Amino acid sequence: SKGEELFTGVVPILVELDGDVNGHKFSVRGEGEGDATNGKITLKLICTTGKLPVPWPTLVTTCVQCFARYPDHMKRHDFFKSAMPEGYVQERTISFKDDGTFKTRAEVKFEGDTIVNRIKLKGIDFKEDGNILGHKLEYNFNSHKVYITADKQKNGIKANFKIRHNVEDGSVQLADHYQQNTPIGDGPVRLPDNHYLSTQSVILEDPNEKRDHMVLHEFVTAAGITHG
Numbered sequence: 001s002k003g004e005e006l007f008t009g010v011v012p013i014l015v016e017l018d019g020d021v022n023g024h025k026f027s028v029r030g031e032g033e034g035d036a037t038n039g040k041i042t043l044k045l046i047c048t049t050g051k052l053p054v055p056w057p058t059l060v061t062t063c064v065q066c067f068a069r070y071p072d073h074m075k076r077h078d079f080f081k082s083a084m085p086e087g088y089v090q091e092r093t094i095s096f097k098d099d100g101t102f103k104t105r106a107e108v109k110f111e112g113d114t115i116v117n118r119i120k121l122k123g124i125d126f127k128e129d130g131n132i133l134g135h136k137l138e139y140n141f142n143s144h145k146v147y148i149t150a151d152k153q154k155n156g157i158k159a160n161f162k163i164r165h166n167v168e169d170g171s172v173q174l175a176d177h178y179q180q181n182t183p184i185g186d187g188p189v190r191l192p193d194n195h196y197l198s199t200q201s202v203i204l205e206d207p208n209e210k211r212d213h214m215v216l217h218e219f220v221t222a223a224g225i226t227h228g
Helices: 072-077
Strands: 011-021 024-035 040-047 088-096 101-110 115-124 143-151 156-166 172-183 195-204 213-223
Touching: 011 040, 072 213, 143 172
Parallel strands: 011 115
Antiparallel strands: 011 024, 024 040, 040 213, 088 101, 088 172, 101 115, 143 156, 143 195, 156 172, 195 213
16 A cells, blocks of 8 residues: 555655653754665754753654555554544653653654654653663663564554663663554555564764764564464
């Protein structure tokens, strides 16, 4: 169908985040491009309000899963691309184990020849000396499995996963991710069989950049289904 026809080449990405964490109001704007044909996503995210009140690794999951590499036999389970022309709504609850929680609502839609991901984030109950508000998380990212299961009742999908953050002392700050995606258009989308996304990420910096920013590389590939 359509949707999958749009991600055949490189598609620009624009990210707009407006956040409130414990009263800290910030805004992130990022630029990049996507390439589902290989699993690739490239973003540069800048904090336009100044210094980010939280570590950048906390915002990776929040700041485009339609750019995943689905194998041919599993393309009938690509919910993200099937709903894309109109877009989808990505809702998330992120529960940091020993600290506050994030609540995010995003609209990921097509704005012309550009993929736009507009997010609203509100986190509360954070420790002023925790690993999040204390900036004790390492500046790298791990590899994780994103478990995607269909949600027939809402004509969408739900996904769950566990986000290993490395802390400066060699411990791990767990961010438990609960997610649900619902299409914005009034159309027939593909509800998938149970599968997962094997994700590899890379967090870098730009040496010539004086702004609070993060450069995010994403390589995600879907698996978990042998048709039979």
